[PDB]
Write a protein that binds this ligand. Structure first.
Ligand SMILES: Nc1ncnc2c1ncn2[C@@H]1O[C@H](COP(=O)(O)OP(=O)(O)OP(=O)(O)O)[C@@H](O)[C@H]1O
Ligand SMILES: Nc1ncnc2c1ncn2[C@@H]1O[C@H](COP(=O)(O)OP(=O)(O)OP(=O)(O)O)[C@@H](O)[C@H]1O
Ligand SMILES: [Mg+2]
Ligand SMILES: [Zn+2]
Ligand SMILES: [Zn+2]
Lengths: 443, 302, 662
DNA sequence: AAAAAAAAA
C-alpha cells in the first residue's frame, strides 16, 4: 500500500530533478526563483510530462485526485532538499506546495459534459459572472481530549475524490473508559488556507438553438484565488467531480462541480505594470512611430468604409483623459463622451460592438431592454437569512472601461435621469432599506 | 508509417480527411465521401469525438492497437496500399518526427515565409524564404519548424478548398490530346504565384483524375492569373499511374514534351513570353497571347 | 422445446408479467423479434430497419426507432405483450437490438455498451384527465406543455456495497430512478450491520425531471389544468424545452409517499411518468401526412430522390407553383415567401464583422386577399414557427422576460417568443394595429440578430436567428394608388428599411379575372368535400390523387426538401457582376427620396445578395450562377417599381428595363 | 417587511 506511493513519489522526484533540455534544468531553477520570492508553487507543462515518460501520464489521467497529492508532496520534499542545509542534523515554515498544470488538449463545451466525464481532467472555456467571498479551510488541526486529555494532530488534504473524504473524530481514545469521540479543536496553533467559489456561464456563440445559457460552479484555493473579476473570459483546466447535498428531488442525486487546477485569462489581470521587458520595448518602439495616429485610425473597424472623424473620436474616447485632484478635495472628470445621432443605414450599431470588443473592459446593452434600478444598483434579499444586500448592475460592471448603449432614444424617461449624477460626478448614492453607501463608477 | 498528412501533429480525422490518396480513392469532395469516411470510423470503432483529438492526448490503448485496427478494417475498401515503412527520428524529450512530415514542413516554409520590379521583388522574397528554410535545418531551432508545420496545414487546407471548387465546376476541358484548366477568378489566387504551390495543386488534381474509371492518359495544362502583372503562369504536367500498380507496366516513366513544345512555338512565333525558370516546363505568358498560343499547341506535333 | 409463435397465444401463468420472464418463452420472443427486425420489408421491398441501423452507426446515436404499426401488422401478439407489460419486453428488445447492431458493426460496443429502443406512435391516445387505475404498468400517450425543467444530474446505475461487519462485497444491483435499494439480511452471513458504497467501481447515468401541464387547446374552457411529473432517462436530456408543447409516450407507475397520506387521511399513492419517446407538436398541428417521431428527417433513398429532382430545369418554377396550391394568383407573393423561408448564409469576416443571412417580408394590401391564409400555410411549413397577432402580443412577450422563481426566490430568465423563433420564422398579423411600444422592441431581432437584457442585476445577451413575416392594412382600409407610400402607412424609415421584400396587393375590377377566381374557388370548395388491400393505403392514395391535381410535388417530400436544403447546402458567391450590381444600386439611390418617398440604403444591396443566395439554395447548388442573380435583381426592381404613384410607374418601368433584360 | 418587473385601467 505505502510502497506504491513511495515509488510514485520517487518517480516524480526523478522527473523533476532530471528533466533537462540542452543545458538547463528548467524546473529546479523555477523552484529556486519561486522560493526566493515566497511563491511556493510550481507549474508543470503536460507535454514535457508526456515526453519524459508515458506511464506517469497514464496514472495521472486515470485517478487524478489520488495521484496529485503524491506529486504535490514530492515537490515540497525536493524544495526542502534543494533549499535548506541539513547542518549534520528550526523554522521549516514551508507548507505543501501548490501544483499548477497547463495543457493544449481539445476543448469540451459545457453542455457536452455528461456522466462519462466523472473524475477526469477536462479543459473548457466560459465567462465569469460572480465571485464569492473568500473562506478559510483547515490543513493541520490540533485536537485535544477531555477525559484522558492528551494532544493529537490531524493532517488533511484538500483533494477528496469522494463525497465524504472526512475523518471527523476517531472512534474510542488512543491507548481510561472515555466517550466515543471526546475530542475538541484547539483553534490556536492551527494552520489555515483560503478557498473561493466562482460561477461560470456558457459562451454566447456556442449556445445551442432555442436554448438558454447554463451555469456551473467552480472552486479554487490558495494562489488561484482572487485572480479573476466578473465579466472576464477565461480558460479553465480542472476536474469534473460530484458532491452530495444531504441538506437538499429525486433519489441518489449528486450535484456536479469543477475543481480549478489552472486558469488562463486574456487580460492576465494586468489592469500596476507587469509587462515583459521585450513587450515594453516593443510598445516604446510603436510609440516612436512618426505616423501612429493614422495607423491606429485605420485599425478601427477596417470593414467600415468612409467614416474618419468618427474613428478619430473613438480613438480619443478609448485612450481617455487625465484624472485630476485638488487640495480642497474637488474631483475633475477624466472621460470623454461620444453620441452618434444620425440617419438609419449609416452603420451606427456596427461600431458599438467593435468598440466593445476592443476595449479591455466593456459592456454592450440596449436602451429598450434596460431599467434604472437594473443598471446602477439592485437591492436583493437572501432567501435563507432574509437580509438586504446590494447587487451591482451593468454600469458598475464596466467601471474603468466603456459602456455601449444603443437605441438611446427608446429608453424610458424615468430611467434616463439616473445617469445624470453617475456621469456628472462618477459616483452613485443609494439610500434604500437603511443602506447609505456611496459607490464609485468611472466609465 | 502511412500515406497521411501530418499524422503525428494533427488529429487522425484531419489526417484521413486531407490525405491525398484517401481523397482520390473515396471522392471526399462530395457528401458521399464524408458518409463513407464516417462508415470507416464507425466500423473501426474509434469514437468520432475521440478521433477528433490531438495525437498527444489521444487514447493510449487505441494508439497501441492502431496497427491491428487498420490491418483488420482497411481491406474492404481498397485502402490497404496506405501502409508503408518509414524513418523516425527522436532526440531527447522533444518528441518524435518522421521524414514525410519534415519534408512537408520544409516545403511549406519554402512556399510561405517572412512589372519587372515586382517580379524581381518576388524572386528576392523567394530567395529569402530559401535562406530561412536553410536556417531552420539545425536542431537548435524548433520555433522555425512548428511554424512550418502550421503553414503546411494552412496551405493544404487552401489547396483542398480550391480543388473541390474546380472539380465541382468541371472547368477541366477535355480535348482530343490533352486536358486543359484555367483559373480565371476565385479567392486567394495570390498564393498560386509560387511554382511549387502550383505544382502541389496540379499533383492533387493529377491524383484525383488518375483515380478514376477513365482509360485515357493525357497531359494536363494548368494556368493562373496575377492581376498586378496581367500575365498567365502556365505549367505543364505529366500523367501518373496509380500508386497501387505492378512494376511490369513501368518500363519507362512518362516523358515531358511540354518544354520542347514551348520552345518550338516560341522559336517560330513572336509571343511575349519569358522562359527563365530552371524547370523548363513552367513559362510565363500574356493574357492576350494565351489563346492563340494554345491553339498553336493544339495544332503542333507533340 | 417447441419455440413456436402459436404457443404464445395462450397463457399458463396467472399474469403476463410472470409469464414473459419464463426461460422457455423468453428465448422464443428473442428469436422471433430478431427475425422480425432482420426480415421486415417495406413497400419498396427493402429492410428499412437495416438502413436505420446503418444511419444509427453513422450518427453514433443511442436510439433506434421501431415503428409501432409495423409491429402490430405482423406478429401482433408481441405488440400486445409490449403494450400491456412494457418493462418485461423492452429489455429483451434492447438485447436483440444490440445484437443486430453488432451484426453490422463488429466491435461497436467500444463506442457504447447499450442501446435504447423507442416506440414511434402507439394506436391509442389519452389525455391528462382520462387517466384511471386500469391503465397502470403499461404504455400511455400523453400530450402536454412543459412548464418547469429541473436540470441535469447523474445517477448510479450499478450499485455495489461493502459491508464491513463481515467484509462482504455485494454484487451489482439495479435502480429504478424512484426507489432506494434496500437489502435486509446482507447475503450469506445473514445479518444486518455497517456498510458503505465504495463507489470507485460503478457506472453512471443522467436524468432530468419536468412538470407537465394540460394543453390549453385541449382543456375544456374555463377549467383548471392537471399537473404531472415526467422523468427522462439518458439520451432524453434537454430534448424538451420550456414552453414547448410536446407529446410523450411513456410508462405509468405509482409509488408510496408520506405527507400525501398525512394530508389526505387515506392511503393514496403518487404517480409519475417515465418517458420513453418524445415528439414535438409546436405549431405544426397537421399530423396525418406521415408517421414517426420527427417528420423533418429523411432516409438515404429520400436523399437520393432529392438529388435526382434537384437537377431538372426550371425547378424553381415548380417550387414556386407548388406553394399554397389552393390560392389563385399572387405569383410574386409566392416567390417572396419561398425566398424568405429558404434564407441565406450568415457571414462572418475575420471574426470581427457579422452580416445577417435572413430575409424579412412585409405584406400590405386590401382586405380579402388571403394574407392570413398564406401566413397560416407558412406556419404549417417551417420547422420552427411562432404566431403572434395585433394587440395580443406585448414588447416583453416577444423578447425574453425576467421572472422570479417561486421556489428558489431569485431573478431568472424566461424565454420569449422570438427565442422560440430562433432558426425559424416569426409570423405577425395585423402589424399596423400593434402599439408602437410593442413594435419598437424587435429592431435588434430583425437587424442585429441578438437580444440584450440588463435587468435586475442580470446582464446577458441572447442570440436570435429569426425571419419576420408581417401583414398589415393601409390607412382607410384600402390602398390609394395616387399617393406615395409615406402617406399610405404610419410606419417610419427605420422600420421600413429593414424589410428586404415589400409587396403591395391591389384589389381591382376585372371581368374575366373575377370569373377565373370564382371558378378556382368553386373547384376548391367541391374538391375538399369530406364525402369524396388495406383501407389506410387506399385512403392515402385517394389523398395523393386529390393533391396531384394542384400540387406538382407531394407536400411531405417538399417538407423534407426544405429541411435538407436549409441543413446542408451552403451557396458560395464568387462570379458576380460587380459593375452591374453597383450601377443598379447607384440607380436605386437615384430617384427614391430625391424624387419620391421610399427609402433605399445599403441594406437593400445585401438583400439582393441574400435573395441570390436563396435562389442558389433552391437548386441544391453550392455556387451562385448568373441566372440566380438575374432573378434576384428582377424581383427587387419589380418590388421597387410597383410601389410608386401611377403617374410615374410606366416611366420607371421603361427606364429600369435595361438591367433585367434577360 | 421592502425592492423591482408586468399588464391592464
Ligand atoms: N459605411 C459602411 N460601410 C460598410 N457597410 C456599411 C456602411 N454603412 C452601413 N453598412 C452596412 O449596413 C448594414 C446595416 O448597418 P447597421 O445596422 O449597423 O446600421 P445603423 O446605422 O446602426 O442602423 P439603425 O439606425 O437602423 O439601427 C450592415 O450590414 C453594414 O455592413
Ligand atoms: N385566390 C384567392 N385570393 C384571395 N382569397 C382567396 C383566394 N382563394 C380563396 N380565397 C378565400 O378568400 C378568403 C381570404 O381570407 P381572409 O379573409 O383571411 O383574407 P385577408 O385579406 O388576408 O384577411 P384579414 O387581413 O382581414 O385578416 C379565404 O376565406 C380564402 O379561402
Ligand atoms: Mg442599430
Ligand atoms: Zn485517553
Ligand atoms: Zn457475512
Amino acid at each position: 500500500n505505502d510502497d506504491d506511493n513511495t515509488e510514485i513519489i520517487k518517480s516524480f522526484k526523478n522527473f523533476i530533478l532530471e528533466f533537462r533540455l540542452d543545458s538547463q534544468f528548467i524546473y529546479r531553477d523555477q523552484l529556486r526563483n519561486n522560493i526566493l520570492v515566497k511563491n511556493y508553487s510550481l507549474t508543470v507543462n503536460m507535454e514535457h510530462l508526456i515526453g519524459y515518460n508515458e506511464d506517469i501520464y497514464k496514472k495521472l489521467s486515470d485517478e487524478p485526485s489520488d495521484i496529485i497529492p503524491l506529486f504535490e508532496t514530492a515537490i515540497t520534499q525536493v524544495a526542502k532538499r534543494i533549499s535548506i542545509l541539513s547542518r549534520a542534523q528550526l523554522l521549516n515554515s514551508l507548507p505543501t506546495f501548490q501544483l499548477i498544470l497547463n495543457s493544449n488538449a481539445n476543448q469540451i463545451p459545457l453542455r457536452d459534459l455528461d456522466s462519462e466525464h466523472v473524475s477526469k481532467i477536462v479543459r473548457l472555456s466560459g465567462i465569469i459572472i460572480s465571485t464569492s467571498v473568500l473562506s478559510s479551510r483547515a490543513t493541520y488541526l490540533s485536537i485535544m481530549c477531555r477525559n484522558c486529555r492528551h494532544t493529537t494532530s490531524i493532517t488533511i488534504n484538500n483533494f477528496n475524490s469522494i463525497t465524504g473524504n472526512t475523518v471527523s473524530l476517531p472512534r474510542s481514545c488512543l491507548s481510561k473508559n472515555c466517550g466515543p469521540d471526546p475530542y475538541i479543536i484547539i483553534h490556536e496553533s492551527s494552520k489555515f488556507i483560503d478557498q473561493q467559489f466562482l460561477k461560470l456561464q456558457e459562451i454566447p456563440e456556442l449556445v445551442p438553438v432555442g436554448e438558454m445559457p447554463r451555469n456551473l460552479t467552480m472552486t479554487c484555493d490558495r494562489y488561484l484565488t482572487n485572480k479573476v473579476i466578473p465579466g472576464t473570459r477565461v480558460t479553465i483546466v480542472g476536474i469534473y467531480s460530484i458532491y452530495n447535498s444531504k441538506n437538499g428531488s429525486g433519489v441518489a442525486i449528486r450535484t456536479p462541480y469543477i475543481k480549478i487546477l489552472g486558469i488562463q485569462s486574456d487580460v492576465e489581470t494586468s489592469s500596476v505594470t507587469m509587462f515583459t521587458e521585450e513587450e515594453e520595448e516593443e510598445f516604446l518602439q510603436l510609440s516612436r512611430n512618426p505616423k501612429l495616429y493614422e495607423i491606429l485610425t485605420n485599425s478601427i473597424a477596417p470593414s467600415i468604409f468612409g467614416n474618419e472623424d468618427i474613428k478619430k473620436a473613438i480613438v480619443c474616447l478609448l485612450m481617455g483623459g487625465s484624472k485630476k485632484i485638488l487640495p480642497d478635495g474637488m474631483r475633475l472628470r477624466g472621460d470623454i463622451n461620444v453620441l452618434l445621432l444620425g440617419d438609419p443605414g449609416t452603420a451606427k450599431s456596427q461600431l458599438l460592438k467593435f468598440v466593445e470588443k476592443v476595449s479591455p473592459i466593456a459592456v454592450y446593452t440596449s436602451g429598450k431592454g434596460s431599467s434604472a434600478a437594473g443598471l446602477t444598483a439592485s437591492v436583493q434579499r437572501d432567501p435563507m437569512t432574509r437580509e438586504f444586500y446590494l447587487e451591482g448592475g451593468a454600469m458598475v460592471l464596466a467601471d474603468g472601461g466603456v459602456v455601449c448603449i444603443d437605441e438611446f432614444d427608446k429608453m424610458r424617461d424615468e430611467d434616463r435621469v439616473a445617469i445624470h449624477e453617475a456621469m456628472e460626478q462618477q459616483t452613485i448614492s443609494i439610500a434604500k432599506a437603511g443602506i447609505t453607501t456611496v459607490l464609485n463608477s468611472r466609465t | 508509417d502511412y500515406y497521411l498528412f501530418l499524422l503525428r501533429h494533427s488529429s487522425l480525422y484531419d489526417s484521413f480527411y486531407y490525405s491525398n490518396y484517401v481523397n482520390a480513392k473515396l471522392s471526399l469532395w462530395n457528401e458521399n465521401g464524408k458518409k463513407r469516411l464516417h462508415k470507416m470510423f464507425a466500423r473501426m470503432g474509434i469514437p468520432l469525438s475521440t478521433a477528433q483529438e490531438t495525437w498527444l492526448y489521444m487514447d493510449h490503448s487505441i494508439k497501441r492497437e492502431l496497427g491491428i485496427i487498420f490491418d483488420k478494417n482497411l481491406d474492404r475498401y481498397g485502402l490497404q496500399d496506405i501502409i508503408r515503412d518509414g524513418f523516425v527520428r527522436t532526440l531527447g524529450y522533444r518528441g518524435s518526427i518522421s521524414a514525410s512530415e519534415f519534408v512537408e514542413a520544409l516545403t511549406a516554409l519554402l512556399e510561405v515565409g517572412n512589372s519587372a520590379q515586382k517580379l524581381t521583388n518576388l524572386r528576392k522574397r523567394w530567395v529569402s524564404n530559401f535562406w530561412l528554410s536553410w536556417d531552420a535545418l539545425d536542431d537548435r531551432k524548433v520555433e522555425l519548424l512548428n511554424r512550418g508545420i502550421q503553414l503546411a496545414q494552412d496551405l493544404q487546407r487552401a489547396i483542398f478548398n480550391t480543388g473541390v471548387a474546380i472539380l465541382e465546376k468541371k472547368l477541366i476541358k477535355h480535348l482530343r490530346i490533352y486536358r486543359l484548366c484555367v483559373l480565371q477568378d476565385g479567392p486567394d489566387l495570390d498564393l498560386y504565384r509560387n511554382p511549387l504551390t502550383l505544382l502541389r495543386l496540379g499533383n492533387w488534381l493529377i491524383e484525383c483524375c488518375a483515380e478514376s474509371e477513365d482509360k485515357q492518359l493525357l497531359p494536363m495544362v494548368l494556368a493562373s492569373i496575377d492581376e498586378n502583372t496581367d500575365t498567365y503562369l502556365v505549367a505543364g504536367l505529366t500523367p501518373r499511374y496509380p500508386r497501387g500498380l505492378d512494376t511490369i507496366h513501368t518500363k519507362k516513366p512518362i516523358l515531358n514534351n511540354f518544354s520542347m513544345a514551348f520552345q518550338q512555338i516560341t522559336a517560330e512565333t513572336d509571343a511575349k513570353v519569358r522562359i527563365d525558370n530552371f524547370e523548363s516546363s513552367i513559362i510565363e505568358i500574356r493574357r492576350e497571347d494565351l489563346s492563340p498560343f494554345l491553339e498553336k499547341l493544339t495544332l503542333s506535333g507533340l | 422445446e417447441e419455440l413456436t409463435l402459436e404457443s404464445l397465444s395462450n397463457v399458463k401463468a396467472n399474469s403476463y408479467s410472470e409469464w414473459i420472464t419464463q426461460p422457455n418463452v423468453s428465448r422464443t420472443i428473442a428469436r422471433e423479434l430478431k427475425s422480425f427486425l432482420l426480415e421486415y420489408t417495406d413497400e419498396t421491398g427493402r429492410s428499412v430497419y437495416g438502413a436505420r441501423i446503418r444511419t444509427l452507426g453513422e450518427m453514433n446515436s443511442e436510439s433506434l426507432e421501431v415503428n409501432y404499426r409495423h409491429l402490430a401488422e405482423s406478429k401482433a401478439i408481441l405488440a400486445l405483450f409490449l403494450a400491456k407489460c412494457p418493462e418485461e419486453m423492452l429489455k429483451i428488445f434492447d438485447l436483440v437490438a444490440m445484437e443486430a447492431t453488432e451484426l453490422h458493426y463488429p466491435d461497436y460496443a467500444r463506442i457504447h455498451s447499450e442501446i435504447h429502443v423507442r416506440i414511434s406512435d402507439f394506436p391509442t391516445i389519452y389525455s391528462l384527465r382520462e387517466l384511471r387505475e386500469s391503465n397502470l404498468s403499461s404504455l400511455v400517450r400523453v400530450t402536454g406543455v412543459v412548464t418547469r425543467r429541473t436540470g441535469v444530474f447523474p445517477q448510479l446505475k450499478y450499485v455495489k456495497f461493502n459491508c464491513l461487519k463481515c467484509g462482504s462485497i455485494l454484487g451489482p444491483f439495479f435502480q429504478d430512478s424512484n426507489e432506494e435499494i434496500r437489502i435486509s439480511f446482507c447475503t450469506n452471513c445473514k445479518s444486518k450491520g455497517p456498510f458503505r458504497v465504495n463507489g470507485e467501481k460503478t457506472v453512471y447515468r443522467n436524468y432530468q425531471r419536468v412538470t407537465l401541464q394540460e394543453a390549453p387547446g385541449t382543456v375544456p374552457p374555463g377549467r383548471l389544468p392537471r399537473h404531472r411529473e415526467v422523468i427522462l432517462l439518458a439520451d432524453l436530456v434537454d430534448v424538451s424545452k420550456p414552453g414547448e408543447e410536446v407529446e410523450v409516450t411513456g410508462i405509468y407507475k405509482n409509488n408510496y409517499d408520506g405527507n400525501l397520506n398525512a394530508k389526505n387521511g387515506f392511503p393514496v399513492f403518487a404517480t409519475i411518468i417515465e418517458a420513453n419517446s418524445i415528439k414535438r407538436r409546436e405549431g405544426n398541428t397537421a399530423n396525418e401526412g406521415e408517421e414517426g417521431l420527427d417528420v423533418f428527417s429523411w432516409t438515404e433513398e429520400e436523399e437520393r430522390e432529392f438529388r435526382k429532382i434537384s437537377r431538372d430545369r426550371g425547378i424553381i418554377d415548380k417550387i414556386i407553383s407548388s406553394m399554397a396550391p389552393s390560392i389563385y394568383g399572387h405569383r410574386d407573393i409566392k416567390t417572396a415567401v419561398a425566398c424568405s423561408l429558404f434564407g441565406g448564409v450568415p457571414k462572418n469576416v475575420n471574426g470581427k464583422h457579422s452580416i445577417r443571412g435572413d430575409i424579412n417580408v412585409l405584406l400590405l394590401g386590401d382586405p380579402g386577399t388571403a394574407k392570413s391564409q398564406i401566413l397560416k400555410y407558412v406556419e404549417k411549413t417551417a420547422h420552427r414557427a411562432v404566431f403572434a397577432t395585433g394587440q395580443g402580443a406585448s414588447a416583453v412577450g416577444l423578447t425574453a422576460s425576467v421572472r422570479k422563481d417561486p421556489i428558489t426566490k431569485e431573478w431568472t430568465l424566461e424565454g420569449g417568443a422570438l427565442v422560440l423563433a430562433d432558426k425559424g420564422v416569426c409570423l405577425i398579423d395585423e402589424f399596423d394595429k400593434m402599439n408602437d411600444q410593442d413594435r419598437t422592441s424587435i429592431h435588434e431581432a430583425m437587424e442585429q440578430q441578438s437580444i440584450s437584457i440588463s435587468k435586475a442585476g442580470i446582464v446577458t445577451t441572447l442570440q436570435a436567428r429569426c425571419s419576420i413575416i408581417a401583414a398589415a392594412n393601409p390607412n382607410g382600409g384600402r390602398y390609394n394608388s395616387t399617393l406615395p407610400l409615406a402617406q399610405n402607412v404610419s410606419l417610419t424609415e427605420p422600420i421600413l428599411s429593414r424589410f428586404d421584400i415589400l409587396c403591395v396587393v391591389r384589389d381591382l375590377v376585372d371581368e374575366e379575372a373575377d370569373e377565373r377566381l370564382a371558378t378556382f374557388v368553386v373547384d376548391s370548395h367541391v374538391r375538399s368535400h369530406p364525402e369524396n388491400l388495406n383501407a389506410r393505403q387506399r385512403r392515402l392514395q385517394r389523398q395523393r390523387k386529390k393533391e396531384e391535381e394542384i400540387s406538382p410535388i407531394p407536400q411531405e417530400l417538399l417538407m423534407k426538401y426544405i429541411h435538407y436544403a436549409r441543413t446542408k447546402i451552403y451557396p458560395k458567391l464568387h462570379q458576380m457582376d460587380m459593375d452591374k450590381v453597383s450601377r443598379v444600386y447607384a440607380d436605386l439611390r437615384r430617384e427614391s427620396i430625391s424624387t419620391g418617398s421610399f427609402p433605399i440604403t445599403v441594406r437593400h444591396l445585401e438583400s439582393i445578395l441574400r435573395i441570390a443566395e436563396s435562389f442558389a439554395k433552391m437548386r441544391l447548388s453550392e455556387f451562385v450562377s448568373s441566372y440566380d442573380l438575374d432573378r434576384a435583381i428582377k424581383v427587387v426592381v419589380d418590388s421597387f417599381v410597383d410601389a410608386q404613384k401611377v403617374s410615374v410607374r410606366r416611366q420607371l418601368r421603361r427606364s429600369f428595363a435595361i438591367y433585367t433584360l434577360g
